[PDB]
């Protein structure tokens, strides 16, 4: 309350830190019409906490890491829900990592029990494990940009993160969508 | 198993030297069309200087052809294994299941056994071409203006000499802390470590 | 040098020996002694103080003391002890621009 | 001891001087490619000669890759063979 | 009791299991000598390999061998990401990342295996006068040359990461067996690694240069060579100063 | 005439007389030595 | 070689010399650098002429490169070099 | 230094530097390799190559149907893609010859 | 040497005052679109290049 | 009149503020903080010029 | 010419130095020296 | 270049070129014969025995102007 807080620091100390992640995550999940939040998909705080702790890390450092970082991680945690095949895997990973009485001896596999045999020696796709690394690549660009932020980041990431660069304003206004 | 691997290795090794001597003989004895001669393919420093300073562009192109005959020979004689691997079997190019066995084969590099050049030839070639460019001011003579002139970029403005010359010990005392900072923050003690 | 040029009507290398000397003095005018107007007053964020000749691996001559160049160095007070020497951080090449522009203004006037 | 010669970071990254690297690199690259391509175009029309000389050299002898623990010039039989091979094929 | 907490033991076990499993199923790779997690309750871990003198360093390395080494180096970090989640990754796998990056920069800038740079030599290893045994000689590059080399290095590295992820995903049962053996014993030998991996259905990587592919009577879209371009934006004063020195 | 009046540095510098393109070549070996 | 320096009047301030002899040295040094290039017995194995050093570095050394576009380095891809 | 008999040598060369390999069936590959290796090993003291002004100057050593006038210098098998069904040039035919004396 | 020099267009100063994609060359891989290789006047590729060669070629734009 | 010079003095008059007469400066360096403060105070002062 | 480098002599027979100095490389040297002497002659008050 | 065509030039004259450049340097940065640079001394001899002979700590925008003046001297010559 500022009994002896100098007035100058007595105003910066009521900042309302904004320390935690779940209140930020729900403001993003409120944009999808299917989900309803509890205490068409029905999700509670335990599921959100476990999914986020698997995908993002510790959940009360939103101020140390920034708000663009939190907004990006919230986008990823939103897309990691909305279909159960990954949701259940993330929950089982969380449960094996903690290690209570109900650790399921390992998380589930990422590959269907079908595609494991589709690439076993008695399968159509075995020989595909023998090609170059030129057949495994997930990106192709014929126009190379002058920035490395544009080479090793996605487009959404660039838009969220480019305001932190050490470049002039005319330079920063040349990255991301040309909408400007 | 080892039989096929040594077949690949030996085929590569023989095609290299065959193509190299074939280009040697051709350029020395048949481009000119008395006694059959065979060159010795070694480029000294004095020879690089002579070629850089006094010879045209075509002489340089001939020397480079001599350097790369063997790699081109290996290239002309190799079996692209993509067809054999995806015929005996059947996002990423290995995800396409449509197309035709013939045009499904250009989606990425051929699987040649011996690809990638040999570092000695690359050193020789770039040394020759760099001598030519930097010791011969063709088409751009206003680029002699910054030669033997240093513009004092990363350093302290006015620094006086050191014990070999001046018996003063302040710049060395500051260099020591510079090295401390480098080890603690930027590099570490070895390659690979995050910090000290 | 300017007299030779105004007599002959053409430049020479005589100027080459003049401006060198003058440049040294002009810098000592702007940085060390603080006479200029570089900043609003003439106080500058960096100066280069001399060291004593005791640090050089020196010799001795039988000559007389120079008229100006070595009798004006009676006003300097160099630095003699090494662990009490002050060198501020070097300027930033946008500040060096303005400081050397003050040197130029002095010389041109 | 910082770097003081920044000149451009708006459409490229440049420092004071370096007004000659693009030119030199274009020259080096184009010359190496043209040489490689002329080599390829010559060998593309002499494939039977390559096959024949390879057969002969394999049956004469050569040093295996693994058998070398510790090709600058040709022996004499190999030169007779290469000269005749240019004459025949 | 145990001086070490659970989740740290789990993380290091998963890391070493991933690295050892992928070094086992990769053709032409060395032999595992020891895999240990926090030996003697010292906070550490390593996978050791059998050093051979039959190796003659003057032998050259083919492209497939270098790519196999890159994949083996990324294996452990990918095992961590796949078992425990991205948010639980530590920086423990940093020297492996450093070595994978060394390999990917030397294939492109020392051996001319990039189709967009070409046969140009920009790096040279060199041995110290004997701390590390070696260092590199470099060449000052422009921004265009360097961005074109960077695109290729990134392609190589992310391709290697995808191959490591598949190699671990089609061996989930052997990965589980190996990490459980490490959680229970904390130090296993190469002999037992082989035994645990074979009793669980390990699936080796194919080797394309040992098969026949022949025949004996005794039984549109993309193109890999498309032309590229670099986009830059120079101002007008900059174009002026380049014409001044272009004569 | 006054050919030196039409000397251009951009489009190329050339004298009046037509390109003394005399040249001959042996192999690289007989050229080096 | 049995062993001029301007580093003495820059940092230590000795200036143990009349201005006239220094001016004469400057005159003769400029004239010698500029006009004694390739003159018999006046212009020889002389380190006071920069063109002799240019020729030496042109034929002996290998092509020197420009500065780099990096940071935390000096001008080329290197660190500050030892003071002693 | 090691050597090999000519039969082993002509089995390492295979369908060595034919330009149209990689699209040839494995049976045809086997047969071509065997036949030419026999010619090379048995008649190796008089096997010339047929006079080049008869076949190899007109360009009949590698023939493409999409480029009969040879304006791609003989790299048509690489520069030109395969025509699709119903397009002009379907179906594409290419030949490769070798002739000896 | 005062009064001499060059003019900004290249002239000395004394003191006072499309490829042809017609035949088979139009059937190459992309042949006209923006993904084509640089060509000469007669329609051949730039340095003598063909899609066979193991190195790509840098498009000017 | 021939006793004058053409020596260029860069930071003269209108060139006494942030660009300092250098043209390539705002394509090499982000504008410092004190420069921004100077510009802000000068903008508001000169906007008070008509109202004063 | 020192420990190695070199590349300036022209009569040694080694791989560096061609033996007769080809004629197209003599025309050039003569053109060079002729242009230099011609300009040193028509320049008022140059050396002799 | 006028006789043998601008393509068939050799490095034979690269030393004399560097001599001429050197003259234009001293006239601009040591004798104050420049017009926009005026009478100020900028060069320093590097005390050594990459190889450099001259060093200068002048700002970058002054280096621009001095080098432009050297270049226009050489163009006129």
Residue length of chain F: 33
H or E element at residue E189 = strand E187-189
- Give the strand order in the sheet containing E45-49: E45-49, E32-37, E187-189
Q: Which chains does G contact via 3+ CB–CB distances below 8 A?
A: B, C, D, E, K, L
Whether D contacts A, i.e. 3 or more CB pairs less than 8 A apart, is: yes
What b/e sequence results for B34-60 when a residue is b if at least 16 CB atoms lie within 10 Å of its CB, and e otherwise?
Answer: eeeebbebebebbbbbbbbbbbeeeeb
Strand I12-13 and strand I5-6: the pairing is: antiparallel
Q: Which of C56, C85, C90 is the closest to B157 by Cβ?
A: C90
Nearest-angstrom CA–CA distance, G38 and G46? 11
SS3 B59: helix
Q: Which two tokens stand for residue D9?
A: 């970071």
- Residue A42 pairs in a beta bridge with A36
Q: Compute the nearest-CA separation of G8 from chain E (Å).
A: 35
Q: Is the dihedral of CA G17, G23, G26, G27 positive or negative?
A: negative
Which among B178, H62, C5, E217 is positioned nearest to J3, based on CA atoms?
C5
Of E113, E135, E136, the closest CA to residue E124 belongs to: E136
The C-alpha of F11 sits at a distance from chain K's nearest C-alpha, in angstroms, of 23
Phi-psi region of I35 (alpha: psi -120 to 50; beta: other; left: phi over 0): alpha
Tell me if B175 and G80 make a contact (CB, 8 A cut-off): yes
Segments in C9-89 forming alpha helices (H)? 14-27
Question: In terms of C-beta distances under 8 Å and separation of at least 24 residues, what long-range contacts does H70-77 make, across chains too?
Answer: H71/I23, H71/I24, H71/I25, H72/I24, H72/I25, H72/I28, H72/I50, H73/D41, H73/I50, H74/D44, H74/D45, H75/D44, H75/I50, H75/I52, H76/I24, H77/H19, H77/H20
Antiparallel, parallel or unpaired: β E229-230 and A143-144: parallel
Q: Which residue in D1, D16, D73 is closest to B40 by CB distance?
A: D73
Residue H52 in contact with partner chain D when CB distance is under 8 A: no
Alpha-carbon distance G77 to E146, whole Å?
Answer: 14
Give SS3 for H60.
coil
Which of helix, strand or coil describes residue E76?
helix
- d(CA C31, CA C47) in angstroms, rounded, equals 5
- Tokens for J39, please give them: 């510009």
Please give the span between the terminal C-alpha atoms of chain G, in angstroms, as a whole number. Answer: 22
Whether K and A touch, i.e. at least 3 CB pairs below 8 A, reads as no
Is the four-CA dihedral B93, B99, B104, B106 of positive or negative sign?
negative
Please give the torsion angle defined by the CA atoms of residues B84, B86, B91 and B92, in that order, rounded to the nearest 10 degrees.
Answer: -30
Place of tokens 């080049």: H52
Task: Give the total residue count for chain L.
Answer: 77
Length of chain B: 196
Q: Tokens 């940085």 map to which residue?
A: C31
Q: D12 CB near a chain J CB, below 8 Å?
A: no
Tokens 């090609």 locate to: A131
| Method used to determine the 3D structure | cryo-EM
Q: Is A126 in contact with E146 (CB distance < 8 Å)?
A: no
| CA H19 to each of CA B77, E209, H55, H96, K32: distance values in angstroms, whole numbers, following the listed order | 9, 22, 16, 8, 52
Contacts of B39 in chain F (CB under 8 A): 27-29
Q: Where are the beta strands (DSSP E) in chain H?
A: 62-64, 94-96
CB G32 within 8 A of CB G49: yes
Residues of J in contact with C45 (CB under 8 A): none
Q: Is J22 on the interface with C (CB under 8 A)?
A: yes
Q: What whole-number distance in Å separates Cα of residue B90 and Cα of residue B93?
A: 14
Q: Which two tokens stand for residue H36?
A: 């030419």
Task: Classify residue E22 as exposed, middle or buried by CB count within 10 Å of its CB (0-12, 13-18, 19+).
Answer: buried
Q: Which of residues 1-20 of F touch L (CB under 8 A)?
A: 12-15, 17, 19-20
Phi/psi at G2 (5° precision): -65, 125
Q: Say how far apart CA F19 and CA J27 lie, in whole Å.
A: 46
| CA–CA min distance J28, chain D (Å) | 5
Chain G residues with CB-CB distance to E138 below 8 A: 77
The set of residues, in sequence order, having a beta carbon less than 8 Å from that of J18 and lying 6+ positions away, is J25, J31, J32, J35, J38, J39
Residue F30 near residue B28 (C-beta atoms within 8 A): yes
Q: What is the resolution of this structure in A?
A: 2.8
The Cα H80–Cα I26 span in angstroms is: 9
What's the per-residue H, E or C state across chain L?
A: CCCCCCCCCCHHHHHHHHHHHHHHHHHHHCCCCCCCCCCCCCCEECCCCCCCCEECCCCHHHHHHHHHHHHHHHHHC
Distance (Å, whole) CA I27 – CA I23: 8
How far apart are the two ends of chain K, measured CA to CA in Å? 30
How far apart CA E30 and CA E51 sit, in angstroms, is 8
User: Which residues in chain H (6-25) have CB-CB distances under 8 A to chain D?
Assistant: 6, 8-10, 12-13, 16-19
- Partner A contacted by E172 (CB < 8 A): yes
Contacts of I11 in chain F (CB under 8 A): 6-9
Q: Residue C14, Cβ neighbours under 10 Å: how many?
A: 18
From CA D28, how far away is CA D19, in angstroms rounded? 16
ω into H49 cis (within 30 of 0) = no
> What are the chain L neighbours of E245 within 8 Å (beta carbons)?
71
Q: Which of G6, G22, G51 to mutate to test the interface with L (most CBs of L within 10 A)?
A: G51
- Nearest to E119, CA basis, from B116, D24, B60: B116
Task: Look at K28 and L13 and tell me if their CB atoms are within 8 Å.
Answer: no
E94 CB neighbour count, 10 Å cutoff = 13
Q: Tell me the torsion sign for CA atoms E185, E186, E187, E192.
A: positive
Using CA atoms of J33, J37, J39, J44 in order, give the dihedral in degrees to the nearest 10: 160
Integer Cα distance of D63 and H2 in angstroms = 6
**CB contact C23 to L (< 8 Å):** yes
Answer yes or no: do C16 and L40 touch at CB < 8 A.
no
Q: Do chains A and F touch (3 or more CB pairs under 8 A)?
A: no
- Are H31 and H81 contacting, i.e. CB atoms less than 8 angstroms apart? no
Total beta-carbon pairs less than 8 A apart between chain E and chain H? 11
Per the CB < 8 A criterion, the answer to whether G48 and L45 are in contact is no
Q: E-strand spans in E21-173?
A: 32-37, 45-49, 124-127, 134-137
* Cross-chain residue pair B102–H21, CB shorter than 8 Å: no
Nearest-Cα distance to chain B for A134, in Å, is: 6
If one counts every other C-beta atom within 10 angstroms of the C-beta of residue A114, the result is 7
Do the Cβ atoms of B46 and K5 come within 8 Å?
Answer: yes
Cα J26 from chain centroid?
13
Please answer whether residues L40 and L32 qualify as being in contact, where contact means their C-beta atoms are separated by less than 8 angstroms: yes
Please, are residues E223 and I29 in contact by the beta-carbon 8 Å criterion? yes
Distance CA L39, CA C107 (A): 8
Helix (H, G, I), strand (E, B) or coil at E134: strand
**Chain J interface, best mutation among D7, D11, D15, D19, by max J CB count within 10 A:** D7
Query: Which residues lie below 8 Å from residue A44, measured CB to CB, with a gap of 6+?
Result: A37, A38
Task: Decide: helix, strand or coil at residue H100.
Answer: strand
* Cα separation, H36 vs H30, whole angstroms: 10
The C-alpha of K3 sits at a distance from chain F's nearest C-alpha, in angstroms, of: 20
Cβ-Cβ contacts under 8 Å, D30 against chain I = 47
- Are K14 and B44 in contact by the 8 Å Cβ rule? The answer is no
Q: K23 to chain F nearest CA, in Å?
A: 9
- Active-site residues of E, by number, are 16
CA distance D56 to D53: 5
Q: Comparing C-alpha atoms, which of B132, L5, G51 is closest to residue K7?
A: B132
CA-based nearest residue in chain I for residue L71: I5
Which DSSP string corresponds to A92-134?
HHHHHHHT-TT--SSPPPSS-TTHHHHTSTTSTTSGGGGS-TT
Tokens 């179906």 label which residue? Answer: H91
């Amino acid at each position: 309350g500022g009994e002896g807080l100098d007035g100058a620091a007595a105003a910066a100390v009521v900042e309302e830190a904004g320390n935690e992640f779940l209140p930020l995550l729900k403001e993003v999940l409120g944009q999808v019409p299917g989900i309803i939040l509890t205490g068409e998909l029905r999700l509670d705080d335990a599921t959100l906490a476990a999914v986020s702790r698997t995908l993002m890390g510790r959940l009360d450092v939103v101020d140390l890491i920034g708000r663009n970082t939190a907004v990006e991680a919230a986008e990823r945690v939103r897309d990691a829900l909305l279909h159960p095949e990954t949701r259940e895997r993330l929950l089982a990973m969380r449960r094996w990592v903690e290690g209570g009485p109900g650790a399921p001896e390992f998380p589930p596999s990422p590959l269907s029990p079908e595609q494991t045999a589709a690439m076993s020696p008695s399968g159509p796709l075995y020989g595909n494990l023998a090609l170059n690394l030129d057949w495994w690549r997930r990106r192709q660009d014929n126009v190379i940009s002058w920035s490395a932020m544009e080479i090793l980041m996605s487009r959404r990431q660039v838009d969220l993160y480019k305001q932190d660069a050490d470049m002039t304003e005319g330079a920063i206004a040349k990255l991301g969508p040309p909408p400007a | 198993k080892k039989s096929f691997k040594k077949k690949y290795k030996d085929k590569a090794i023989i095609y290299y030297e065959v193509g190299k001597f074939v280009l040697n003989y051709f350029l020395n004895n048949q481009l000119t069309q008395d006694i059959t001669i065979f060159g010795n393919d070694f480029l000294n420093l004095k020879t690089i200087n002579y070629l850089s300073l006094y010879n045209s562009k075509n002489k340089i192109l001939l020397q480079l052809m001599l350097i790369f005959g063997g790699k081109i020979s290996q290239l002309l004689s190799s079996k692209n294994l993509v067809k054999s691997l995806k015929q005996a079997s059947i996002g990423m190019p290995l995800g396409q299941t449509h197309l035709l066995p013939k045009a499904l084969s250009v989606l990425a590099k051929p699987m040649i056994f011996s690809d990638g050049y040999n570092n000695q030839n690359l050193k020789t070639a770039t040394t020759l071409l760099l001598s030519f460019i930097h010791k011969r001011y063709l088409y751009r003579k206003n680029l002699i203006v910054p030669k033997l002139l240093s513009f004092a970029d990363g350093n302290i403005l006015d620094e006086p000499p050191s014990p070999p010359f001046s018996s003063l010990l302040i710049p060395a005392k500051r260099f020591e802390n510079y090295k401390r900072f480098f080890r603690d923050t930027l590099t570490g003690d070895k390659m690979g470590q995050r910090k000290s | 040098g300017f007299a030779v040029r105004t007599a002959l009507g053409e430049e020479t290398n005589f100027t080459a020996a003049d401006i060198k000397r003058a440049t040294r003095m002009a810098k000592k005018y702007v940085f060390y002694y603080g006479f200029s107007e570089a900043g609003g007053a003439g106080i500058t964020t960096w100066a280069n103080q001399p060291y004593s000749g005791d640090f050089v691996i020196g010799q001795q001559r039988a000559r007389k003391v120079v008229s100006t160049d070595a009798m004006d160095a009676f006003a300097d007070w160099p630095t003699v002890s090494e662990d009490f020497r002050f060198d501020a951080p070097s300027p930033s090449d946008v500040t060096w621009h303005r400081y050397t522009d003050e040197v130029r203004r002095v010389l041109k006037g | 001891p910082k770097r003081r010669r920044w000149l451009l970071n708006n459409g490229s990254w440049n420092f004071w001087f370096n007004f000659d690297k693009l030119y030199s690199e274009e020259i080096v690259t184009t010359w190496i490619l043209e040489s490689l391509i002329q080599t390829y175009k010559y060998l593309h029309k002499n494939t039977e000669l390559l096959d024949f000389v390879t057969n002969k050299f394999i049956t004469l002898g050569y040093i295996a890759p693994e058998n070398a623990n510790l090709q600058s010039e040709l022996l004499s039989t190999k030169e007779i063979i290469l000269t005749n091979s240019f004459k025949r094929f | 009791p145990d001086p070490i907490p659970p989740q740290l033991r789990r993380a290091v076990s998963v890391y070493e299991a991933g690295k050892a499993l992928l070094a086992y199923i990769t053709p032409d790779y060395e032999e595992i000598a020891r895999v240990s997690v926090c030996p003697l309750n010292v906070l550490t871990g390593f996978t050791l390999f059998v050093e051979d003198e039959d190796k003659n360093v003057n032998a050259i390395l083919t492209r497939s061998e270098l790519e196999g080494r890159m994949v083996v180096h990324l294996a452990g970090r990918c095992a961590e990401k796949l078992v425990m989640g991205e948010g639980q990754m530590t920086g423990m796998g940093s020297p492996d990342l450093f070595h994978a990056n060394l390999i990917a920069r030397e294939m492109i800038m020392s051996m001319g295996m990039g189709r967009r740079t070409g046969p140009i030599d920009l790096l040279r290893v060199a041995a110290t006068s004997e701390g590390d045994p070696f260092y590199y000689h470099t060449t000052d590059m422009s921004t265009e040359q360097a961005r074109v080399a960077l695109a290729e290095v990134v392609e190589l590295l992310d391709a290697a990461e995808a191959k490591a992820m598949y190699g671990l995903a089609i061996n989930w049962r052997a990965l589980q067996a190996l990490t459980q053996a490490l959680l229970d014993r904390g130090t296993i030998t190469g002999k037992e690694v082989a035994h645990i991996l074979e009793s669980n259905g390990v699936i080796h990587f194919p080797d394309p240069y040992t098969t026949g592919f022949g025949w004996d009577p005794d039984g549109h879209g993309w193109h890999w060579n498309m032309p590229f371009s670099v986009k830059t934006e120079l101002p007008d004063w900059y174009k002026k100063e380049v014409e001044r020195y272009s004569y | 005439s006054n050919w030196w009046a039409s000397i251009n540095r951009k489009t190329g510098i050339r004298g009046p007389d037509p390109a003394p393109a005399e040249e001959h070549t042996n192999g690289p070996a007989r050229d080096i030595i | 070689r049995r062993p001029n320096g301007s580093f003495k009047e820059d940092f230590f301030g000795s200036q143990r010399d009349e201005v006239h002899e220094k001016n004469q040295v400057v005159y003769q040094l400029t004239r010698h650098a500029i006009t004694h290039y390739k003159k018999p017995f006046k212009g020889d194995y002389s380190l006071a002429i920069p063109t002799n050093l240019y020729v030496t570095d042109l034929f002996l050394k290998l092509p020197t490169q420009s500065i780099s576009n990096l940071t935390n380095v000096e001008n080329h891809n290197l660190s500050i070099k030892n003071k002693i | 230094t090691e050597s090999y008999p000519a039969a082993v040598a002509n089995d390492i060369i295979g369908m060595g530097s034919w330009r149209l390999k990689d699209d040839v069936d494995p049976v045809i590959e086997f047969l071509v390799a065997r036949l030419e290796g026999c010619w090379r090993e048995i008649l190796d003291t008089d096997l010339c190559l047929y006079p080049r002004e008869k076949w190899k100057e007109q360009g009949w050593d590698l023939v493409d149907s999409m480029d009969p006038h040879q304006e791609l210098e003989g790299f048509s098998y690489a520069d030109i893609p395969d025509p699709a069904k119903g397009e002009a040039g379907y179906p594409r035919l290419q030949l490769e010859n070798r002739v000896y004396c | 040497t005062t009064g001499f020099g060059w003019d900004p267009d290249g002239s000395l100063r004394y003191p006072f005052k499309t490829p042809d994609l017609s035949g088979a060359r139009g059937k190459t891989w992309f042949a006209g679109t923006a993904y084509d290789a640089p060509r000469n006047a007669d329609g051949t590729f730039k340095h003598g290049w063909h899609w066979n060669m193991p190195f790509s070629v840098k498009t000017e734009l | 009149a021939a006793a004058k010079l053409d020596m260029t003095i860069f930071t003269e008059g209108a060139n006494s503020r942030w660009p300092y007469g250098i043209e390539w400066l705002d394509d090499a360096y982000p504008k410092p903080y004190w420069v921004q403060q100077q510009e802000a105070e000068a903008a508001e002062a000169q906007a008070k010029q008509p109202a004063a | 010419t020192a420990g190695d480098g070199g590349g300036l002599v022209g009569g040694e027979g080694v791989e560096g130095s061609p033996d007769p100095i080809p004629p197209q490389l003599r025309r050039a040297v003569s053109v060079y020296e002729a242009g230099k002497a011609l300009l040193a002659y028509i320049t008022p008050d140059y050396e002799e």
